[PDB]
Design a protein around this ligand. Structure first.
Ligand SMILES: O=[Se](=O)([O-])[O-]
Ligand SMILES: [Ca+2]
Length: 240
C-alpha cells in the first residue's frame, strides 16, 4: 500500500500472506482474509498462475521471525465460476482457498467478519486497506504490514466519467482516490476493513488499480464487494 503507515503488531488478525514457491524459497504475492479455520478468501487473479501456494497466518514482518506465524498449504482452490482473467473489469475477482490443515486461532490469528449479504456502504465510509504490497507505484513490497485509511467512493461517484466510469460495477467497492494513498500490487486479494456497528468487517477483496499507477487522483483502489458474494461463499464452504 502506498502512503500507508505500519500496522500495530497483528492489529488485523485475519490478514494472511499468500505466497508461492520460487526455487527453494517463498515469495509473497497477495493478501487474503482467513474466513474459517481452514478457508481463506482472496482474489481470483492471485491464483491465475498454476503455482505452489502456501498461506501464512499471524504474520507481521515478511523477512523476520515474529514468533507468531503459522504456515499451511493450500489443498484446493475454488475460483468464482464467472471470473475471466481477460476482463477484471467484469468483476467476480474472488477465490476461496481450502487449507490443508485448520490453523489455530489465537491473539494473532482470527477469523475475519464479513458483512451481511447485499450491504452497501454509504459514500465516504471509513475503511482501512492492509497489506504488504508495493509502497510506491512500480516499487517494492513492504517488509512490515501496512495500513492506509481509504474512505469509500460510492458507485455513483466511482462510475462517473472523471473517476472509473464504466470500468467499475456495482459488484465492486471503490476506496481512496486521494492521489496519495492506495492499494498496490501485492495487496491484491487482501481486505478492505470498514467499521459497521462497532465492528470492523471485511467489505472488499483488493482487485485493481489504474494502469497509470497505484495512487492516482480520482482512480480509487477497486475491490470485489464481499457482500455480493455471501451466498456463493457459503455454498462453496458447504460443498467442500
Ligand atoms: O444485492 Se447484491 O449484494 O448486488 O446481490
Ligand atoms: Ca515473519
Amino acid at each position: 500500500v502506498v502512503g500507508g503507515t505500519e500496522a500495530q503488531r497483528n492489529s488485523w488478525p485475519s490478514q494472511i500472506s499468500l505466497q508461492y514457491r520460487s526455487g527453494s524459497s517463498w515469495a509473497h504475492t497477495c493478501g487474503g482474509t482467513l474466513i474459517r479455520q481452514n478457508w481463506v478468501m482472496t482474489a481470483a487473479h492471485c491464483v491465475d498462475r498454476e503455482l505452489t501456494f502456501r498461506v501464512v497466518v499471524g504474520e507481521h514482518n515478511l523477512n523476520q521471525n515474529d514468533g507468531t506465524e503459522q504456515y499451511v498449504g493450500v489443498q484446493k482452490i475454488v475460483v468464482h465460476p464467472y471470473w475471466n482473467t481477460d476482463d477484471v473489469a467484469a468483476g467476480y475477482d474472488i477465490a476461496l482457498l481450502r487449507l490443508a490443515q485448520s490453523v489455530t486461532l489465537n491473539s494473532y490469528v482470527q477469523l475475519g467478519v464479513l458483512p451481511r449479504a447485499g450491504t452497501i456502504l454509504a459514500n465516504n465510509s471509513p475503511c482501512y486497506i492492509t497489506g504488504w504490497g508495493l509502497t510506491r507505484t512500480n516499487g517494492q513490497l513492504a517488509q512490515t504490514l501496512q495500513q492506509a485509511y481509504l474512505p469509500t467512493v460510492d458507485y455513483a461517484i466511482c462510475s462517473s466519467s472523471s473517476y472509473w466510469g464504466s470500468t467499475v460495477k456495482n459488484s465492486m467497492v471503490c476506496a481512496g482516490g486521494d492521489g496519495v494513498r492506495s492499494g498496490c500490487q501485492g495487496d491484491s486479494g487482501g481486505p478492505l476493513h470498514c467499521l459497521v456497528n462497532g465492528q470492523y468487517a471485511v467489505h472488499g477483496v483488493t482487485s485493481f488499480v489504474s494502469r497509470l499507477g497505484c495512487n492516482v487522483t480520482r482512480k480509487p483502489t477497486v475491490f470485489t464487494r464481499v457482500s455480493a458474494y455471501i451466498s456463493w461463499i457459503n455454498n462453496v464452504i458447504a460443498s467442500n
